[PDB]
């Protein structure tokens, strides 16, 4: 279920790479990656769903 536990936790580097992104370091990986939630948009996910 959890992401943690098969990816370590980002960097403070990470931390501040998405507005409204979730950021997850995965070990296997061995690099960084973000993903967008749903309802939001924007290149960094900085846009948010509100019409």
């Not at 370091?25 to 924007?42: D, H, I, M, S, V």
Request: with cysteine.
């Amino acid at each position: 279920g959890d992401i943690s536990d098969y990816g370590d936790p980002c960097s403070d580097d990470l931390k501040d790479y998405c507005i409204h992104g979730d950021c997850f370091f995965l070990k296997e990986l061995n690099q960084p990656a973000c993903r967008c939630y749903t309802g939001y948009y924007g290149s960094r996910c900085e846009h948010i769903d509100h019409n």
